[PDB]
Coordinates of C-alpha atoms and ligand atoms in Angstrom, one line a residue:
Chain A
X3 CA 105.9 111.3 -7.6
X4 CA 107.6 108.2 -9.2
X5 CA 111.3 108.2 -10.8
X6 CA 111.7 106.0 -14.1
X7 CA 115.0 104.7 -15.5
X8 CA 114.5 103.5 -18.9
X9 CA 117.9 101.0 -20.2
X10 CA 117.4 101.2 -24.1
X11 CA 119.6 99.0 -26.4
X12 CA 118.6 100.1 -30.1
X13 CA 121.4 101.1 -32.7
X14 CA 118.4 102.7 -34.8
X15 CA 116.2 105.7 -33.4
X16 CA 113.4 104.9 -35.8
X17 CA 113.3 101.3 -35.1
X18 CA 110.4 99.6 -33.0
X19 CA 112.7 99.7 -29.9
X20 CA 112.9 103.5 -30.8
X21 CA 109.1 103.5 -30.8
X22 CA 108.3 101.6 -27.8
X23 CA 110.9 103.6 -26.0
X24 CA 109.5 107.0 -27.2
X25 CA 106.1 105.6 -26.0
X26 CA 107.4 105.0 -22.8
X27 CA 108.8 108.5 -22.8
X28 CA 105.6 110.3 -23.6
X29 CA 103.0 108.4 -21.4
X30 CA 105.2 108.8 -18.2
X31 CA 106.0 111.9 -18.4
X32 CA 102.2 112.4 -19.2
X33 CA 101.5 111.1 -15.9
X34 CA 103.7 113.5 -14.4
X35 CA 106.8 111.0 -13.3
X36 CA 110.2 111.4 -13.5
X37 CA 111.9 109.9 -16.4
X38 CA 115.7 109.0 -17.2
X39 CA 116.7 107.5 -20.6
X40 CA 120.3 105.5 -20.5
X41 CA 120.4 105.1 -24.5
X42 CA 123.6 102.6 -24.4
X43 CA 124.4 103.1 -28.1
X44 CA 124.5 106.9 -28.3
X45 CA 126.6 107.0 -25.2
X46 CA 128.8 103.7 -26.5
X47 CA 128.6 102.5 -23.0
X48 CA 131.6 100.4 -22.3
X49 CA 130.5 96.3 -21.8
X50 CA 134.0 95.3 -21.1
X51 CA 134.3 93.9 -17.4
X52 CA 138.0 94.9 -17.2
X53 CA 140.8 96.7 -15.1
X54 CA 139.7 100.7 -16.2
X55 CA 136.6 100.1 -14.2
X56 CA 139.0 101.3 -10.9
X57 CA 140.0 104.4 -11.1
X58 CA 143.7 104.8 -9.5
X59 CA 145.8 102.1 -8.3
X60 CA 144.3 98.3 -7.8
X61 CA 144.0 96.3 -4.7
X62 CA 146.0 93.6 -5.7
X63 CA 147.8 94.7 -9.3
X64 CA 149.1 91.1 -9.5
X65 CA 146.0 89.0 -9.6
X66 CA 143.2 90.6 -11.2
X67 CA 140.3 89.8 -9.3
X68 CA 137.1 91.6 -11.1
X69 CA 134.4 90.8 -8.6
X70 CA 136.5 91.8 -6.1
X71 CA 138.3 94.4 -7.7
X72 CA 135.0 96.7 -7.8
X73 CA 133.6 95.3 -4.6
X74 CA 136.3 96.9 -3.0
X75 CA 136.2 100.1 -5.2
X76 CA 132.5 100.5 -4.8
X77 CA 133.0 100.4 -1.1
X78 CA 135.8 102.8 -1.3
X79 CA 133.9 105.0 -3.8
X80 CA 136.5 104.4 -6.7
X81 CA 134.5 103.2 -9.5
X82 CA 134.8 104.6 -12.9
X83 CA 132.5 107.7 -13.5
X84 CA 130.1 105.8 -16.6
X85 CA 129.2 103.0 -13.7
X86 CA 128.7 105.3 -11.0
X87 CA 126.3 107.6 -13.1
X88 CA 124.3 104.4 -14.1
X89 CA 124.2 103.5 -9.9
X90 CA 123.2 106.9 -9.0
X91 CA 120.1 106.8 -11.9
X92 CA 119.3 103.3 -10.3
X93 CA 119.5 104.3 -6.8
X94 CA 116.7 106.7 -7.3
X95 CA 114.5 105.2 -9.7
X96 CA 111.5 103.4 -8.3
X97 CA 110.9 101.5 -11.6
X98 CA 113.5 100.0 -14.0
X99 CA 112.7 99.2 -17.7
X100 CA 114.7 97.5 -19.7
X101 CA 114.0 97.8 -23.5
X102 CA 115.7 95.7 -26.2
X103 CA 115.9 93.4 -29.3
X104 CA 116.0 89.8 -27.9
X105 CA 119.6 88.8 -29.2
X106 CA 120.2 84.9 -28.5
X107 CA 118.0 84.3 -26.4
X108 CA 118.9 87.2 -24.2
X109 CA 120.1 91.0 -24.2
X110 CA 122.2 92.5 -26.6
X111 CA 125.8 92.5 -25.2
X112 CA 126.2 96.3 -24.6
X113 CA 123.2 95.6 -22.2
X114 CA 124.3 92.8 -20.9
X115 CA 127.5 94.5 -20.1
X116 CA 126.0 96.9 -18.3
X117 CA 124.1 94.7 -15.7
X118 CA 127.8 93.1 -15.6
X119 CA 129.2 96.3 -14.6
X120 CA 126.4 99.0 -13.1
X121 CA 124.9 95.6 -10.8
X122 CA 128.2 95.2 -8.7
X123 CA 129.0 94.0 -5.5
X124 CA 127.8 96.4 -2.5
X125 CA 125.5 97.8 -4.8
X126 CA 123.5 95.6 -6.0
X127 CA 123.7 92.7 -3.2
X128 CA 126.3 91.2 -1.2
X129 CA 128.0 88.0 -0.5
X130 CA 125.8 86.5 1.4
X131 CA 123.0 89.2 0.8
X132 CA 121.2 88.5 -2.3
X133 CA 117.8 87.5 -3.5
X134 CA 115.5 89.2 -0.7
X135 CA 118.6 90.2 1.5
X136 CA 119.1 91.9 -2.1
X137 CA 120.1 95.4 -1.6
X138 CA 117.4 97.2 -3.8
X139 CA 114.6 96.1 -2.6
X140 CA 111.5 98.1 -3.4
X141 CA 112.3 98.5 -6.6
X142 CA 110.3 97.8 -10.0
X143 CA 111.7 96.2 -12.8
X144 CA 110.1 95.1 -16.2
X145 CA 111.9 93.9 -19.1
X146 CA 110.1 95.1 -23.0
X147 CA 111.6 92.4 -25.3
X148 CA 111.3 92.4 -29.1
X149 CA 111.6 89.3 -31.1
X150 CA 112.3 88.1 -34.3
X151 CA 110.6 85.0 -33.9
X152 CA 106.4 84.8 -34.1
X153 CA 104.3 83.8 -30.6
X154 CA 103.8 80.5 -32.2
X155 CA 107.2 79.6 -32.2
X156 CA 108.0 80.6 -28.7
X157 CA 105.0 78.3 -27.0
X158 CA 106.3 75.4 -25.2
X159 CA 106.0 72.7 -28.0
X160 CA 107.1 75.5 -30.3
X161 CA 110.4 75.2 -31.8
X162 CA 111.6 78.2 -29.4
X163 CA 110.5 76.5 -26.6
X164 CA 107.8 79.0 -24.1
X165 CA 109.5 82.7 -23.8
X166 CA 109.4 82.5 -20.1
X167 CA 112.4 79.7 -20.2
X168 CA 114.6 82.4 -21.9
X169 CA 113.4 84.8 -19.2
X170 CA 114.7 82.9 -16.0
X171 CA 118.6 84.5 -16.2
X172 CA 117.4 88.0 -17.0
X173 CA 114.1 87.7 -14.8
X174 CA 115.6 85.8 -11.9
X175 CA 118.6 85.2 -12.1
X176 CA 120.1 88.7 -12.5
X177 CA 116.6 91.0 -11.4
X178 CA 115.8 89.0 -8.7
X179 CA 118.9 88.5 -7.5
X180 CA 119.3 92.0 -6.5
X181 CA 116.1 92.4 -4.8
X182 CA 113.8 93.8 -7.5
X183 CA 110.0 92.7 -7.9
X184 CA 109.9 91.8 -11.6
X185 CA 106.1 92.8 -13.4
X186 CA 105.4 91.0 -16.3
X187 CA 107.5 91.1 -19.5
X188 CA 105.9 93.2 -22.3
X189 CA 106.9 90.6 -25.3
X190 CA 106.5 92.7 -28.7
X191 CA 106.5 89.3 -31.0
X192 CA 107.8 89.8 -34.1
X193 CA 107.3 93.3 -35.7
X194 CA 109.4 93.3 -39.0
X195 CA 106.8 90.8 -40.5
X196 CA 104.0 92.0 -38.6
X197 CA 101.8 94.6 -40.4
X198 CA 101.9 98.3 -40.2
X199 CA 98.3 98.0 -38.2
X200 CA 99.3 94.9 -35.9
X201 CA 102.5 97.1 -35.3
X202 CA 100.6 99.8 -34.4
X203 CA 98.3 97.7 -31.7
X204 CA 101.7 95.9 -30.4
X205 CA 102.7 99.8 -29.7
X206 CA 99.2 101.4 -28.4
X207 CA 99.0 97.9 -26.1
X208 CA 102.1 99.4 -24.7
X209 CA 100.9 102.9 -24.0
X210 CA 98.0 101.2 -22.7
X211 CA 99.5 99.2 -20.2
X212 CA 102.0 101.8 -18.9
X213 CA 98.8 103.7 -17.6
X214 CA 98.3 101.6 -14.9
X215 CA 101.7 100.3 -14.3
X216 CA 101.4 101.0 -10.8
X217 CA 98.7 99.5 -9.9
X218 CA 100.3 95.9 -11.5
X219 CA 100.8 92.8 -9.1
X220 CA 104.9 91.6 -9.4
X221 CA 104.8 88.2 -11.1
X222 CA 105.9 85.7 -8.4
X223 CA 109.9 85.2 -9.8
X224 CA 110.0 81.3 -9.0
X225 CA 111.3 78.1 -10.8
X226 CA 107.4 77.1 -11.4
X227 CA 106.4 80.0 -12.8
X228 CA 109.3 80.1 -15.4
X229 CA 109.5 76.7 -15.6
Chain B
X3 CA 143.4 64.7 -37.1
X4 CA 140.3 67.6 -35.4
X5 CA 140.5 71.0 -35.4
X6 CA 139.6 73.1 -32.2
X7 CA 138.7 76.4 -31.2
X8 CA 139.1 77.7 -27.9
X9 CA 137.0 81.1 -27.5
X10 CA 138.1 82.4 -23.5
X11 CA 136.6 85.1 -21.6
X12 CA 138.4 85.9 -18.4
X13 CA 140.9 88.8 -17.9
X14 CA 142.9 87.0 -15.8
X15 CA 145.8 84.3 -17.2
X16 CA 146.5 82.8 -13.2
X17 CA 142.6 82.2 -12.7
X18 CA 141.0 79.4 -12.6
X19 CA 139.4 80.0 -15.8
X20 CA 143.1 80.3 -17.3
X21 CA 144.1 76.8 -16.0
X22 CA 141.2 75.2 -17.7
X23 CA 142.0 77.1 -20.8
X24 CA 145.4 76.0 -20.0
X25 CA 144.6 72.0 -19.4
X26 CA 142.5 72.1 -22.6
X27 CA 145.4 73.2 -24.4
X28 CA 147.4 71.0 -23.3
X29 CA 145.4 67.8 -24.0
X30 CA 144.0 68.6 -27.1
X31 CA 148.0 69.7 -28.0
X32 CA 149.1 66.2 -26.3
X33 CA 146.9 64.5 -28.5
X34 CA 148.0 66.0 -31.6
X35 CA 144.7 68.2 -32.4
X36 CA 145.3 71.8 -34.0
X37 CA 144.2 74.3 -31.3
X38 CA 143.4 77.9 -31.3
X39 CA 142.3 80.6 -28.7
X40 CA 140.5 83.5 -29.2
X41 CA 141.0 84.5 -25.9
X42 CA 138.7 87.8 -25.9
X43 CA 139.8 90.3 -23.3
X44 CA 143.7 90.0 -24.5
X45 CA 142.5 91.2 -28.2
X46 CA 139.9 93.8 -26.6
X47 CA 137.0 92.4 -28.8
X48 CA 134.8 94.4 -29.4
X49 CA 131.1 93.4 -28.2
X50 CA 128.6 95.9 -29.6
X51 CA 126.5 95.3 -32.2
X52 CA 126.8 98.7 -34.4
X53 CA 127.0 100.0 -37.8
X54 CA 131.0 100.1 -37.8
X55 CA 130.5 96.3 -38.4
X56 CA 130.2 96.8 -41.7
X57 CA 132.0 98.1 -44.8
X58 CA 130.0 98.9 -47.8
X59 CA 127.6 100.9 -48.5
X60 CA 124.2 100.1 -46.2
X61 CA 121.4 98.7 -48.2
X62 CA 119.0 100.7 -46.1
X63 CA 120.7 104.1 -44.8
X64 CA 117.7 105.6 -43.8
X65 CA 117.3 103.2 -41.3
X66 CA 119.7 100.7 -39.8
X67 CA 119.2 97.4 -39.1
X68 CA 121.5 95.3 -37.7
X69 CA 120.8 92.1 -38.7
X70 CA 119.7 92.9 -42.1
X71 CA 123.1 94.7 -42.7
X72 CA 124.9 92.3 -41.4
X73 CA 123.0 89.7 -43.4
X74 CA 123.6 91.5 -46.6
X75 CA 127.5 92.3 -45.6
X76 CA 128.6 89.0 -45.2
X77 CA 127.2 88.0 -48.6
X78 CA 129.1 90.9 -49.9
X79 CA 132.2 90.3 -48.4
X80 CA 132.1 94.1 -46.2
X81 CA 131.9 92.8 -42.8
X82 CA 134.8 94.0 -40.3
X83 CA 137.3 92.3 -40.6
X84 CA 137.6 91.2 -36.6
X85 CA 134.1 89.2 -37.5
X86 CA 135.5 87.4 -40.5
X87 CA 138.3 86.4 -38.9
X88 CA 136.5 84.8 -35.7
X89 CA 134.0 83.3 -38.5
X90 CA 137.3 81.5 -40.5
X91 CA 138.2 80.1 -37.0
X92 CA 134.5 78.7 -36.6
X93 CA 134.3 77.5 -40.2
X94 CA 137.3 75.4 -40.1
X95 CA 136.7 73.8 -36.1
X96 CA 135.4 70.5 -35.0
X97 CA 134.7 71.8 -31.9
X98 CA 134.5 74.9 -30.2
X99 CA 134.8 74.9 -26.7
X100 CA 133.9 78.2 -24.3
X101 CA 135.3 79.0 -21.2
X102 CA 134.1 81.5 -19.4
X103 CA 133.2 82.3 -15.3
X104 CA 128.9 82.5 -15.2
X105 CA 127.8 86.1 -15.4
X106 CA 124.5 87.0 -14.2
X107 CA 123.3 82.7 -15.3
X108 CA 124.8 83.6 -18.4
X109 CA 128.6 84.5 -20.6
X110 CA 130.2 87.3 -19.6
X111 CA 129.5 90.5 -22.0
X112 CA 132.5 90.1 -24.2
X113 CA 131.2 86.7 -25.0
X114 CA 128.0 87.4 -25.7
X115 CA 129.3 90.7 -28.1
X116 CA 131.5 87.4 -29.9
X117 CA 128.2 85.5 -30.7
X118 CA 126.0 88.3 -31.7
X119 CA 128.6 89.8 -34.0
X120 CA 130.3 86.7 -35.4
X121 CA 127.4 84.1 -35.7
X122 CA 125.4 86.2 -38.4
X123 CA 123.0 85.9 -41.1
X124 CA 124.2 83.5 -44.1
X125 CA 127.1 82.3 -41.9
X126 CA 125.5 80.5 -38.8
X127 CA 122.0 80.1 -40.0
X128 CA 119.5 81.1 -42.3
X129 CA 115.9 81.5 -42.8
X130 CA 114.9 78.5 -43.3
X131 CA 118.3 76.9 -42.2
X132 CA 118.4 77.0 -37.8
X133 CA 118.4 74.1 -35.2
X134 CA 119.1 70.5 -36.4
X135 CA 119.6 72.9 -40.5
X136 CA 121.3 75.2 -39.1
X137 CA 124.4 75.7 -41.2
X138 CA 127.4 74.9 -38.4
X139 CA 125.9 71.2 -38.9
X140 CA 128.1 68.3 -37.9
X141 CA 130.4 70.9 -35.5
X142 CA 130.5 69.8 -31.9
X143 CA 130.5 73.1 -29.1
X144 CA 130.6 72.6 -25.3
X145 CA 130.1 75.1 -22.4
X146 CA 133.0 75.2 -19.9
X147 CA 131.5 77.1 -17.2
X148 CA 132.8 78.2 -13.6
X149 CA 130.2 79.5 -11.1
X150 CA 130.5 81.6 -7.5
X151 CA 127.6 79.5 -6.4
X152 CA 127.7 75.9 -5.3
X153 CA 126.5 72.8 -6.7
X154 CA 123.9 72.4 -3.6
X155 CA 122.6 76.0 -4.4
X156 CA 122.4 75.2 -8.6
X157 CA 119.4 72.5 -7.8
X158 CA 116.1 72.1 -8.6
X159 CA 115.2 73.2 -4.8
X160 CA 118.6 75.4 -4.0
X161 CA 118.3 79.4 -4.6
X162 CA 119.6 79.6 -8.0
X163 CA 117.6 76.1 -9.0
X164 CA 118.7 73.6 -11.2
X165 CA 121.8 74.8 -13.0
X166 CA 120.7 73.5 -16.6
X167 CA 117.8 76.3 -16.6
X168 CA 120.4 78.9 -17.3
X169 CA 122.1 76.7 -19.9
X170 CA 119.0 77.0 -22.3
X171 CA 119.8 80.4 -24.2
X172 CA 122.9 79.3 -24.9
X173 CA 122.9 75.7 -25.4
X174 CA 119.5 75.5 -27.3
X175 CA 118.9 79.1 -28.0
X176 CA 122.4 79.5 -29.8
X177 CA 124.7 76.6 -30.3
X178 CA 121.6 74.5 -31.3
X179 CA 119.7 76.6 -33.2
X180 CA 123.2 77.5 -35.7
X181 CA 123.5 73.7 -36.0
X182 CA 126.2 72.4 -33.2
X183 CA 125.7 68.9 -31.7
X184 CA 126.2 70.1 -27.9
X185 CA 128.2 68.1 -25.9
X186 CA 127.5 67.9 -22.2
X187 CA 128.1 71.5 -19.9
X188 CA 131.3 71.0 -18.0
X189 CA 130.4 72.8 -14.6
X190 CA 133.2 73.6 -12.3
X191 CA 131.4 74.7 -9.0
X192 CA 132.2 77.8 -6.8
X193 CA 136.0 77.3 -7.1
X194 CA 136.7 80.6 -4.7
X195 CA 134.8 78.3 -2.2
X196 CA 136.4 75.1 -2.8
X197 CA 139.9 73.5 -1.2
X198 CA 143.3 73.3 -3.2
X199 CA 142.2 69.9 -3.1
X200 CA 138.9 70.3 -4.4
X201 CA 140.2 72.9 -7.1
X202 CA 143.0 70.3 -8.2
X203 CA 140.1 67.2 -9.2
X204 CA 138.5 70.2 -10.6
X205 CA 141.5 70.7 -13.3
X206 CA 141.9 66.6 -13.3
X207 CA 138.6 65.9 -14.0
X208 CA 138.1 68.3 -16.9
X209 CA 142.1 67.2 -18.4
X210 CA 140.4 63.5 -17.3
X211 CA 137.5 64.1 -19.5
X212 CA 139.2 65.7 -22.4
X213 CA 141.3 62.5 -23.3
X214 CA 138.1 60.9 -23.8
X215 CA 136.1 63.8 -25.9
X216 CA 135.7 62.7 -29.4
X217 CA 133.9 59.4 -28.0
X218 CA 131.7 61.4 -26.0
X219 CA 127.6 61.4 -27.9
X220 CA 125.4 64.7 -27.9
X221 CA 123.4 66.2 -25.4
X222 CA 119.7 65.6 -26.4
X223 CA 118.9 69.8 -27.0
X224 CA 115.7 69.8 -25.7
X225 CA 113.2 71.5 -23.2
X226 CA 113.1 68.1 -21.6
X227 CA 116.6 67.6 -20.9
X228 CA 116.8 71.4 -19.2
X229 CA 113.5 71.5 -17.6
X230 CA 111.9 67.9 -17.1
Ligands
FAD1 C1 122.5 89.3 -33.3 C2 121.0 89.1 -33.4 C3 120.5 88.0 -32.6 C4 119.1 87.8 -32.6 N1 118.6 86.8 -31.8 C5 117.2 86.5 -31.8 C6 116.7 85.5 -31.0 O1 117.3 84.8 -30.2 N2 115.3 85.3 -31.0 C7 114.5 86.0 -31.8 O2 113.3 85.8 -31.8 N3 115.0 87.0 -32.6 C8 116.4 87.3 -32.6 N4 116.8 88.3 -33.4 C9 116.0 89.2 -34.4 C10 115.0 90.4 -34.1 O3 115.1 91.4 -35.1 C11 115.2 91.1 -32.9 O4 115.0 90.1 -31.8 C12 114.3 92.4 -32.8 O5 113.3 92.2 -31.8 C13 113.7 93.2 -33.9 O6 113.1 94.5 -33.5 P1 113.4 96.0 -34.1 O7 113.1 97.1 -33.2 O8 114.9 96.1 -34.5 O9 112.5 96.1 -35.4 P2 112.6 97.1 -36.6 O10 113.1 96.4 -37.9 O11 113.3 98.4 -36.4 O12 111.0 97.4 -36.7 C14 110.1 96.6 -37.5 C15 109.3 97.6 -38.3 O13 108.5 98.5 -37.5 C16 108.7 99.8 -38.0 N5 108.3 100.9 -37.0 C17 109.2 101.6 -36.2 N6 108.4 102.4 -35.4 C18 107.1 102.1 -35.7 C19 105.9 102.6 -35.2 N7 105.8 103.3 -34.1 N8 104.7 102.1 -35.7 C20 104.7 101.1 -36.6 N9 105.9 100.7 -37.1 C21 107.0 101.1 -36.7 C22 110.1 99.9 -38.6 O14 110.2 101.0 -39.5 C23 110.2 98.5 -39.2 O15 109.8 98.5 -40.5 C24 118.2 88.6 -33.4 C25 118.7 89.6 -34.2 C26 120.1 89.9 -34.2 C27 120.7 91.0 -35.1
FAD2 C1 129.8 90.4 -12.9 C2 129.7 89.1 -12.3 C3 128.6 88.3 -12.3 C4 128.6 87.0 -11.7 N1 127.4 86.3 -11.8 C5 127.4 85.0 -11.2 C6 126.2 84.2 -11.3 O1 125.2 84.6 -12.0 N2 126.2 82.9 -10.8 C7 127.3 82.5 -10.1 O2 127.2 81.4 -9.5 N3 128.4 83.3 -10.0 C8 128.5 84.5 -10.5 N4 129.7 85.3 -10.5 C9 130.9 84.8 -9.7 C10 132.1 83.9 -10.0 O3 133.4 84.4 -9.5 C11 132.3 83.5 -11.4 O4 131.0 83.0 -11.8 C12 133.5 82.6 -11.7 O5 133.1 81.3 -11.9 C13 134.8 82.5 -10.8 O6 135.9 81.9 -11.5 P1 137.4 82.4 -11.6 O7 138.3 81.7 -12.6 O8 137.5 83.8 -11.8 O9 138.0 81.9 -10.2 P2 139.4 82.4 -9.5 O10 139.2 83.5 -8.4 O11 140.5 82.8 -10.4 O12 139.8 81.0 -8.8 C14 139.6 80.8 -7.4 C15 140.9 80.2 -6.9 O13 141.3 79.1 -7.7 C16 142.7 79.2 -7.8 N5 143.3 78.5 -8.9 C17 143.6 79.0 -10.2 N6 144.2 78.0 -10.9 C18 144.3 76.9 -10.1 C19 144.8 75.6 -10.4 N7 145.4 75.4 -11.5 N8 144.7 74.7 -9.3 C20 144.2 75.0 -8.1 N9 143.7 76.3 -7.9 C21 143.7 77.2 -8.9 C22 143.0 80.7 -7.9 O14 144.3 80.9 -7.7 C23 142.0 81.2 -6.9 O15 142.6 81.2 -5.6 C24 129.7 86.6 -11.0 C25 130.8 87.4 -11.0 C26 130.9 88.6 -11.6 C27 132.1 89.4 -11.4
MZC3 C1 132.7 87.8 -7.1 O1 131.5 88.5 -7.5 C2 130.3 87.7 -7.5 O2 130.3 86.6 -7.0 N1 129.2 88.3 -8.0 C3 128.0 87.6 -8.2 C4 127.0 88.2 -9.0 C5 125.8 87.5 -9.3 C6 125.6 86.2 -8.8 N2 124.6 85.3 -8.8 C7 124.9 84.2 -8.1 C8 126.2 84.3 -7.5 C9 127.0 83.4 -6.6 C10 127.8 84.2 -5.6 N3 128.5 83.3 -4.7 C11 127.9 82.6 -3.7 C12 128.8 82.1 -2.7 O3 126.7 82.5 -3.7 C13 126.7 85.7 -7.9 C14 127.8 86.4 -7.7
MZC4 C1 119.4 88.6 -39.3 O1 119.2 88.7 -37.8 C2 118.5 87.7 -37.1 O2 117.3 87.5 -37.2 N1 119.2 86.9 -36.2 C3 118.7 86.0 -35.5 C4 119.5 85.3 -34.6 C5 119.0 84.3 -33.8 C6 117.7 84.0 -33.8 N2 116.9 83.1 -33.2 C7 115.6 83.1 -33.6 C8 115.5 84.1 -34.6 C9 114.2 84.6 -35.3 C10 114.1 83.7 -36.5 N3 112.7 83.6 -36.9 C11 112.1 84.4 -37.8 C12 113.0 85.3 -38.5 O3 110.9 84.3 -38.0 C13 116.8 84.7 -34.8 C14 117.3 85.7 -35.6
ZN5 ZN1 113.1 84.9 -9.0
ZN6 ZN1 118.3 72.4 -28.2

């Protein structure tokens, strides 16, 4: 028995995003897992890092420290509700996937907010106590991008540069960091000029793959491999 | 006489971040530029990307697309109006200049909603119309950056490697590709680490090279100059 937590940044339910995400859906709980959807739109998660993310009086109301601020709440188990709900669904999943529209070069800010604000400190990892000493360890994590640009464009003499360089801070820098083994980005290049036929392979390769998701080798999460 | 804009990201005026700000301010003031601050968590800016952004009616209702919307609103004249005015701050800089702590080897999410939301469609960039066409052309930007982790551990054989990898989405990926020259990161390293000493030539050094800016040439933007 396997628990999934699927992160899904899409404004659009009908959108590719939408698609891959109810593909995910179906062929997991097919398999018989345990599935969990945080749809960030639909519940207009918060991506501010600010003040209301302690419940109750602050540590120190005269310095805001935000770091420490929630380090301290965390410990003390006074974190605001949406964060601790998001903690709990990543506590007991064994895989993370994370599935988006690549926005600069990176995830859409209501994503990015919430690795800014679910990933804190105590949860996540400590200071020291990161990378390997990073405290969920064990877990799975796989990010399924969408792009606007083609494949061309994102090979290392492509205008784009390779897609792996824009992996490193999601990849390592945050997934790492915190102790997950990273499997191999699923890179959906380019859909909206894609045909209706190449869109349906990008989506059946997708299925595909996520039947034997658990038998997949972590990518080693190193500077050469990025890089 | 240059026009700059200062967007900030740090909810705290009395951090570290602030005094940059702060220094910046001052400099470009002492020097007789025209400054402004979109300093992000004071107006409670609002990051996501959704279909609030715009006005008019959607060219596609049945199904929403944010980039094409958007696209289509700012020819139109029906984006929010929070977008527009962050856009008429942009449009009339010489430079733009973000501060901001590193979150996860990248702007905190309040930042990042800023450049997904303001740098749309027919504004930043078009297709065909990105990188050295991009439509910001002749605008300088530059990352001010503060980091928990020290300059030892941000090289190429530290934990967090060489701390220009991280750069890339942002300097290329965004600033580049919507037509800024980038001008060298500034990089102030682990400050919560550092001595009131060490934190002082931090300020200095940043007020030091400020007096100096509009001398100061272009990064070259490439993979090269990131990675080797
Ligand atoms: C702020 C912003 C920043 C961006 N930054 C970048 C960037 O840095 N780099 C980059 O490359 N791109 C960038 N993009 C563009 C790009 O659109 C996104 O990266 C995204 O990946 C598009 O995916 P989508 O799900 O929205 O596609 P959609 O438009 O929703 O889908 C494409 C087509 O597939 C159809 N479809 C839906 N379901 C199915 C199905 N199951 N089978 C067949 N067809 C289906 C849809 O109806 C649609 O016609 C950016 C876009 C924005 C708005
Ligand atoms: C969600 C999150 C993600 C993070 N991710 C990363 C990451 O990926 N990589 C990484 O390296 N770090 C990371 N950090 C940590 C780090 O704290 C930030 O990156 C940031 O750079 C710290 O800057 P600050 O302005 O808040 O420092 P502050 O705590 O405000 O400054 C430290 C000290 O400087 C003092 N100071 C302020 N002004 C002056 C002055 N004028 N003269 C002398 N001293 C002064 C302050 O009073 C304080 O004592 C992360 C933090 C968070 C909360
Ligand atoms: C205050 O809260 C955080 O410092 N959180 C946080 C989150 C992700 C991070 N990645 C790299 C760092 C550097 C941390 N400092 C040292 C001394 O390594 C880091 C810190
Ligand atoms: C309107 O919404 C966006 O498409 N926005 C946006 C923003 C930053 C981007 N960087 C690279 C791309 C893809 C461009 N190549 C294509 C379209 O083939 C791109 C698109
Ligand atoms: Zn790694
Ligand atoms: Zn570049």
């Amino acid at each position: 028995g396997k628990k999934v937590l699927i992160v899904y940044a899409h404004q659009e339910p009908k959108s590719f995003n939408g698609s891959l995400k109810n593909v995910a859906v179906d062929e997991l709980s097919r398999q018989g897992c345990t599935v969990t959807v945080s749809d960030l739109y639909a519940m207009n998660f918060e991506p501010r890092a600010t003040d209301k993310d302690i419940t109750g009086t602050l540590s120190n109301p005269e310095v805001f420290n935000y770091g420490v601020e929630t380090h301290e709440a965390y410990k003390q188990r006074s974190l605001a509700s949406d964060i601790t709900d998001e903690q709990k669904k990543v506590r007991e999943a064994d895989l993370v996937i994370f599935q988006f529209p690549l926005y600069w070069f990176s995830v859409p800010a209501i994503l990015k907010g919430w690795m800014d604000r679910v990933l804190c400190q105590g949860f996540a990892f400590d200071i020291p106590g990161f990378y390997d000493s990073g405290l969920l360890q064990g877990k799975l994590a796989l990010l399924s991008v969408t792009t606007g640009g083609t494949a061309e464009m994102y090979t290392k003499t492509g205008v784009n540069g390779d897609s792996r360089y824009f992996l490193w801070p999601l990849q390592h820098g945050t997934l790492h960091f915190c102790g997950f083994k990273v499997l191999a980005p699923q890179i959906s290049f380019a859909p909206e000029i894609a045909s209706e036929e190449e869109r349906k392979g990008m989506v059946a390769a997708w299925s595909q793959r996520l039947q034997t998701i658990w038998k997949e080798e972590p990518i080693p999460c190193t500077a050469h491999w990025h890089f």
